[PDB]
Amino acid sequence: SGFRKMAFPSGKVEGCMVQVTCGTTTLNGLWLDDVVYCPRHVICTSEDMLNPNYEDLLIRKSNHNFLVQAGNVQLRVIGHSMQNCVLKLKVDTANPKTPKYKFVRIQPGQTFSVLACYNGSPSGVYQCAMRPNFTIKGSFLNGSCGSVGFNIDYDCVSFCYMHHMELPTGVHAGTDLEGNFYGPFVDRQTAQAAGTDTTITVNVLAWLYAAVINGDRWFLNRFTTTLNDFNLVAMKYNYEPLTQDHVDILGPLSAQTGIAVLDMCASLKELLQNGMNGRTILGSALLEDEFTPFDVVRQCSG
Amino acid sequence: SGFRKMAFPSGKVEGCMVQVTCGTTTLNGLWLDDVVYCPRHVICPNYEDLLIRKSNHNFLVQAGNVQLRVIGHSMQNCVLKLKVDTANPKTPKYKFVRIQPGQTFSVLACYNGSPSGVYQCAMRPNFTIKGSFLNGSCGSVGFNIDYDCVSFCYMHHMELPTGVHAGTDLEGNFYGPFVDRQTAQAAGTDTTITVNVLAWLYAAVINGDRWFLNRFTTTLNDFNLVAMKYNYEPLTQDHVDILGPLSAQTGIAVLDMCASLKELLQNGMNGRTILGSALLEDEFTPFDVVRQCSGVTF
Ligand SMILES: C[C@H]1c2nncn2CCN1C(=O)C[C@@]1(C(=O)Nc2cncc3ccccc23)CCOc2ccc(Cl)cc21
Ligand SMILES: C[C@H]1c2nncn2CCN1C(=O)C[C@@]1(C(=O)Nc2cncc3ccccc23)CCOc2ccc(Cl)cc21
Ligand SMILES: [Cl-]
C-alpha cells in the first residue's frame, strides 16, 4: 500500500556523470563506453548564446580545449563531433561503470527520473514527466545542464532526456540523447516561451485507477460517457484529448479494478466539475498527472 | 528554478542490497562490510527461541547472482545480523543514525534484493512513514547522504492497517510504539510538521510565489495556540533558529512567515496553489530546502 512519486534507483546513471569544461563554461556530461555526451552550448559563452554558429565555434576547438573530469581523474579527449544539439567527446578510456543502455526518444505524458548534477556530481533524483507542451517541470539551477532523464527497464538504462535550458516561466527544455530538442525549442537565448500547458488526461485516469487499487472509491459515480463527450468536457479544463490509444492502454487497469475506462472518464468529468470538496485522492488535493498507466502497474503490482 | 520532492542519489545504497531467504520468507538485507542486516521476522513470536533453532546454512543470502555464505548470526533488538565470509567491496563510508520525527530521508524500495525505486519521505510525528511498499519490501532502507557518508536511519519492517509503514533504526529499535508481530497495531493520530511547512513556504518564496505573504507578524505563543487547533506540531525556538538562514535570504522573519501560515490555516488557499500543491506540504525540512535551492552534491 501507499502511492509515492517514485524515481528509479540512480546508481547506474551516477557512475556515468562527468564534468565537462570548455573555457569558462562548466556543465555535466554522460560518459558511456568511450564517449562523453553533453549539450553543445558548453562551447558557447553567454554572449555567443543569442545567435551562436555552433559549426563555426566548434571548428575553432581542439580536443585539448575540452577538460573532462570523472571523479578525481581527468579523461583525455581524443575526438569530437556534433550531432544535432549534443556534443560527443571521444575519450581514451571506456567507462568501466557503463551500464546496459539505450537512447530512447519519449512522447509527451511519458515519465522519467532525473539525476540532477552540478560539476559532474549527482545531487538528487526526482521524477518528471514530459509535459504536453514539451517542457519538464524540473528542479534545476545554473550548472545543471547535461543532467539526464532516464528510465530503467530490468537492468537496462533508457536515456531519454538531457537538460539544456530553463525557459522564463521556470520550466525546462532539453533534448533526447541524439541531441534533438523536445518541442519547438532551440539552444539560443532568443525570446522563447513554453506553449500553454495542458493536463495529461491518460495519466490522471491511471492515477484514479491507482487510488481505486489502494482502496479509495469516493469519486466514482453511476455514470459513463462517450469518448467524444468526455473530450468536449476535458478540453474546457485544459485537459489533453483522450485518444482510443489511451483507452486501450488503460485496459489492464480497467480489468484489474472492474471499472470501465469510460466509467472512470465520467468520474474524472465529475471531479473537474465539483472539485474534491475537502477530500484528497492518494494524499493529493489536485488531480495528479505525472504517473503513467505503466508507472501505476509497476508501483501497485510489481 | 523548480521545486521537487527530491531523494538522495541511491547508488551507494544499491551496492549494499542483498536478498535474504530463511525457509519460506524472502526479504531484503543490507550488506555492509562482512555483515548483512535484515528484519529479525525473516525467521518467522519468541525470537530467541526461533533463532536458537537455526543454523548459519538455513539463511540463504544472495548478492546479485552470487550466494554469500553465512558464518555467524546474532540479534540486536529487532534486527538480525548475519555474519558473512565476504566483506562487501562496495561498502560506502557509513554510519547508523536514529532520526527524529519531522526529519526526512530517502527510501530505496527493494524486492528480492533488487532496488526498484527511490523516494523521499518524512518520519511522521506519529512515528510512521507514508511509504509505498508491497509484500517483499521488508528490509528496504532509509538513508541520508552527507558529503560521501551514507547515514542509514530506517529499515522497513511492516505495514499498518491504514496503509502507512513502520520500521526500525539500523540498531533494530522501532520508531514508534510498534512491535514486530502479527497483532492489533494502529498508527496514532498524526500531526503536521510545522517547521517543515514553514521551510516549504520559504522554498515557495525563493521560487517566486509570494501571494500568501502578509504584513503581519505573531508571537511564538500565539502561533502555537493557533497551530494546536489545526493538529500542527508545536513550533519551538529551535525551529525558529533553524529557519534563520531562509528568513535572512528571503527577508521574511520566521514569525512573519508564521502569520502567513496562520492565515493559510484559517482561510485556506482559495483556489490557489503553492509550488503546484493545494495542500500545505510538510515533508521538506529547512535543510532540504537549502540543499535543493543551492545545489549541494554527493
Ligand atoms: C552553460 C551556460 C553557461 N555557463 N557559462 C556560460 N554559459 C553559456 C551557455 N550556458 C547557457 O546559456 C545556459 C542557459 C540556461 O538556461 N541555464 C540554466 C539551465 N537550467 C536551469 C537554470 C537555472 C537558473 C539559471 C540558468 C539555468 C542560460 C540562459 O539562457 C540559455 C538559453 C539557451 C540554452 Cl540551451 C541555455 C541557456
Ligand atoms: C516477511 C513476511 C513474510 N513473508 N512470508 C512469510 N513471512 C513472515 C514474516 N512477514 C510478515 O509478517 C510481514 C508483514 C508486513 O507487514 N509486510 C508488509 C510490509 N510492507 C508492505 C506490505 C504490503 C502488503 C502486505 C504486507 C506488507 C505481514 C503483515 O503482518 C506483519 C506484522 C508484523 C511485521 Cl514486523 C510484519 C508483517
Ligand atoms: Cl514514450
CATH code of the domain containing A162: 2.40.10.10
Residue that finishes a domain, picked among A65, A99, A133: A99
Residue that finishes a domain, picked among B48, B70, B92: B92
- Among B122, B116, B291, B292, which Cα is nearest to B197's? B122
Note whether B136 and B267 are same-domain residues: no
Note whether A204 and A290 are same-domain residues: yes
Note whether A224 and A133 are same-domain residues: no
Q: Which atom of ligand 1 lies nearest, measured to the CA of A189?
A: 32
- Among B144, B145, B147, B142, which Cα is nearest to B157's? B142
Q: Return the bridge partners of B35, or none.
A: B32, B83
Give the technique used to solve this structure: X-ray
Given a contact cutoff of 8 angstroms between Cβ atoms, the answer to whether B289 and B199 are in contact is: yes
Choose the catalytic residue: A128, A145, A265, A300. A145
Which residues in chain A are closer than 8 Å to B278, comparing Cβ atoms?
Answer: 284-286
Note whether A73 and A57 are same-domain residues: yes
d(CA A208, CA A213): 9
Q: B278 burial class (0-12, 13-18, 19+ CB within 10 angstroms)?
A: middle
d(CA A144, CA A146): 6
Q: Say yes or no: A154 contacts chain B, CB-CB below 8 A.
A: no
Q: Is A16 a catalytic residue?
A: no
User: From residue A191, how far is each of A75, A80, A86, A196, B91 by CA, in Å?
Assistant: 36, 30, 21, 16, 49
Note whether A2 and A139 are same-domain residues: yes
d(CA B42, CA B20): 8
Note whether B97 and B65 are same-domain residues: no
Note whether B249 and B269 are same-domain residues: yes
Residue A174: count other Cβ atoms within 10 Å of its Cβ.
Answer: 30
d(CA A138, CA A149): 10
Residue that finishes a domain, picked among B36, B69, B92: B92
Domain span at residue B56 reads: 15-92
Domain at A222, CATH number? 1.10.1840.10
Amino acid at position A237, single letter: Y
Note whether B52 and B66 are same-domain residues: yes
Given a contact cutoff of 8 angstroms between Cβ atoms, the answer to whether A161 and A145 are in contact is: no
Note whether B195 and B287 are same-domain residues: yes
Note whether A235 and A86 are same-domain residues: no
CA distance A56 to chain B (A): 31
Note whether B101 and B79 are same-domain residues: no
The DSSP letter of residue B56 is: G
Note whether B47 and B108 are same-domain residues: no
d(CA B225, CA B220): 9
d(CA B197, CA B226): 15
d(CA B91, CA B136): 23
- Domain count of the fold of chain B: 3
End-to-end CA distance of chain B: 20
Q: Say yes or no: A73 contacts chain B, CB-CB below 8 A.
A: no
